[PDB]
Every structure is written in structure tokens, then in C-alpha cells.
Amino acid sequence: YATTATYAIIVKSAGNPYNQKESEGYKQVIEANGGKCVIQEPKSATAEDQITCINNAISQGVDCIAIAANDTDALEPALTEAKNQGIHVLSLDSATNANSRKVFVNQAGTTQIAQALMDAILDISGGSGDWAVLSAASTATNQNAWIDGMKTVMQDSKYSKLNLIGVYYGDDEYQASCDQTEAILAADPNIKVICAPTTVGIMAAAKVLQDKGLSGKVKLTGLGLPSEMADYIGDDDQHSCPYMFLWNPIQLGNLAAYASISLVNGTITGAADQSFTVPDKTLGDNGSYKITAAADGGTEIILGAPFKFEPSNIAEWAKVY
Numbered sequence: 215y216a217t218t219a220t221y222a223i224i225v226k227s228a229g230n231p232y233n234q235k236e237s238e239g240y241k242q243v244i245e246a247n248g249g250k251c252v253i254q255e256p257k258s259a260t261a262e263d264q265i266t267c268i269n270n271a272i273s274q275g276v277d278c279i280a281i282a283a284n285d286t287d288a289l290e291p292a293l294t295e296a297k298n299q300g301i302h303v304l305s306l307d308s309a310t311n312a313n314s315r316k317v318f319v320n321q322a323g324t325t326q327i328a329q330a331l332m333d334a335i336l337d338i339s340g341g342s343g344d345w346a347v348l349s350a351a352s353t354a355t356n357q358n359a360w361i362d363g364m365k366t367v368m369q370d371s372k373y374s375k376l377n378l379i380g381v382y383y384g385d386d387e388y389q390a391s392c393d394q395t396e397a398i399l400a401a402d403p404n405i406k407v408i409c410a411p412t413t414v415g416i417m418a419a420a421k422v423l424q425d426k427g428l429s430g431k432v433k434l435t436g437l438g439l440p441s442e443m444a445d446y447i448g449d450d451d452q453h454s455c456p457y458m459f460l461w462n463p464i465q466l467g468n469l470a471a472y473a474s475i476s477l478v479n480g481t482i483t484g485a486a487d488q489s490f491t492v493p494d495k496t497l498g499d500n501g502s503y504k505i506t507a508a509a510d511g512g513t514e515i516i517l518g519a520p521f522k523f524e525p526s527n528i529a530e531w532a533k534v535y
């Protein structure tokens with residue numbers, strides 16, 4: 215994994231601790247192995263602000279770009295231009311389309327996240343009732359994939375007494391996510407569960423439910439940082455979130471860095487059925503990963519399974535991320 219190349223990571227947006235942990239993990243591995251890492255945080259979680267960052271990376275003459283896409287398709291011209299300049303493009307966290315990358319590094323199976331969330335809603339609701347999604351940007355590939363996944367999973371007869379009222383967008387912004395939580399509550403006060411598959415959205419919704427005194431009546435699940443959600447997690451009337459899920463964003467960054475170095479050094483090309491082993495034997499199968507065909511027609515590397523954070527384990531993990 216020795217490298218002397220320069221690697222740009224472009225996260226979704228500024229002002230999001232999840233993205234900072236991702237970029238930290240990426241930088242740590244790149245630098246440990248001799249490369250240079252340049253991190254960019256788009257001003258907002260939009261395609262427009264990301265394109266500006268892609269263009270900056272190209273201008274700096276970097277060797278590799280790793281990107282968490284704010285839109286599945288809008289980045290394609292800039293990323294193609296990067297490729298035309300000889301830059302390896304990798305995607306992580308939120309996928310660019312298959313034509314815009316050599317490989318996607320996915321935190322967990324898309325289906326695994328959808329299934330965990332649907333089963334959580336079914337459990338936490340008591341088996342029936344109205345629920346809503348508080349998403350991030352309406353264009354974000356990952357939330358859209360999870361939401362599509364949930365909608366597929368929820369067709370199963372076991373979920374037939376649940377009713378999804380709709381999808382609201384908090385844009386991965388605290389204030390917007392608080393405002394949309396209030397909008398959800400106003401639209402359906404009898405809602406049983408809010409599912410927020412965004413670390414920003416879930417902690418914003420938690421804050422709103424706590425402030426309104428609703429933790430005993432409206433429950434909350436989703437995808438959140440243990441560090442942010444620790445005080446909201448509990449199985450009683452005083453905590454809105456009985457449990458939620460995530461994965462290690464630092465390790466997501468780590469793996470994306472190992473894969474980036476592997477692309478630059480030519481150890482992999484992104485093609486299905488290729489394998490690589492990273493120094494870190496806690497990832498994969500004793501460090502080993504295989505590239506698999508992805509549903510979007512590209513290829514992907516899957517970091518691990520989702521991890522459930524609940525009262526029995528939340529405090530220890532809150533110090534990790």
C-alpha cells in the first residue's frame with residue numbers, strides 16, 4: 215500500500231460530523247502510507263457545490279478523487295473530465311452513477327439497511343400505525359436507495375398494518391431537519407414512528423421530539439452517530455429512540471482509502487470478482503474484500519453489515535464516533 219500519490223476526498227457537505235469522521239479515516243490511511251490527502255467539504259449538500267470541489271481537485275492535479283455523491287447523475291460531466299485527465303474516480307457513502315466511477319465503497323448492503331429499518335419500525339410502532347421518513351437531500355443517492363429499499367421491503371405482508379405517510383427532506387442540515395420534523399408532526403399528529411436515515415436528520419428530530427415532550431408518544435429510529443444520539447436512546451417514555459443503526463464512518467473512510475490506493479497502484483481496477491487484502495484484518499474477511507456487481511449496474515465493495523445501537527451498547531460506542 216505504499217503510495218506517493220495525491221488523493222482528494224469530497225464529502226457530501228460541511229457541518230456534518232459524520233462526514234468529518236469519514237474524511238478523517240480516509241486521510242489517516244492515505245497519509246500513513248505516504249500519500250497526500252486533500253479534503254473538501256461542499257458548502258451545502260448539493261450537486262452544484264460539489265462540482266465546484268471536483269473542479270478544484272482537477273485543477274490541483276490530484277491522482278485520485280473519492281466522492282460521496284449529492285446527486286447520482288449531475289456529477290457525471292465533471293467526473294468524466296477528471297477521468298479524461300487520468301484521475302482515478304472512486305465513490306463512497308453515496309454513489310455516483312456507474313459511468314462516473316471505477317467502484318463504489320458501500321457502508322453496508324442497501325437491502326440490509328432497508329430491512330433493519332423496516333423491522334425497527336414494525337417493532338417500535340407496536341406492529342401498526344403511521345410512520346414517515348425524514349431524509350437528507352432529495353437527490354442523495356444513498357438515502358434514495360435506502361428509501362427505495364424500504365418501500366420494496368415493506369410490501370411484505372408482515373408490514374401490512376403500517377402506513378408510510380411520505381418522505382420529507384431535511385437536506386442534511388440541522389435547522390431544515392428540525393423544521394421538517396415539525397412539519398411531519400403537524401401533518402400527522404398521530405404518527406407512531408419517524409424514520410430518519412441521516413445522521414443529521416435523526417439528531418435534529420430527536421431534539422424536536424424532546425423539546426415538544428413527545429418522546430413517550432412518537433418514537434424515532436434511523437441512521438445516527440452514537441456520539442450524538444446517546445442521550446436520546448432508551449427503552450422508556452423519556453427517550454424517543456429505542457434503537458437505531460449505523461456502521462463505522464472512520465472505517466468506511468479507511469476502506470475507501472485502501473481501495474483508492476489499490477486503484478492508483480493498479481492492484482485493482484474496480485472490476486467485479488477482483489479481490490484485495492488490506493493491512494487492517496478487522497475489515498472484511500481477515501482483511502480481504504471482493505468487488506461485487508452492484509444493483510445500479512456498476513460495482514461495489516461492501517464494508518460490513520449494519521450495526522444496531524441500543525441501550526445495551528450505546529454508551530461505549532458514543533466515544534468512538
Ligand SMILES: C[C@@H]1O[C@@H](O)[C@H](O)[C@H](O)[C@H]1O
Nearest residue numbers: 232307350411412413437
Ligand atoms: C447516514 C448518513 O447520514 C448523513 O451523515 C449523510 O447523509 C451520509 O451520507 C449518510 O450515510
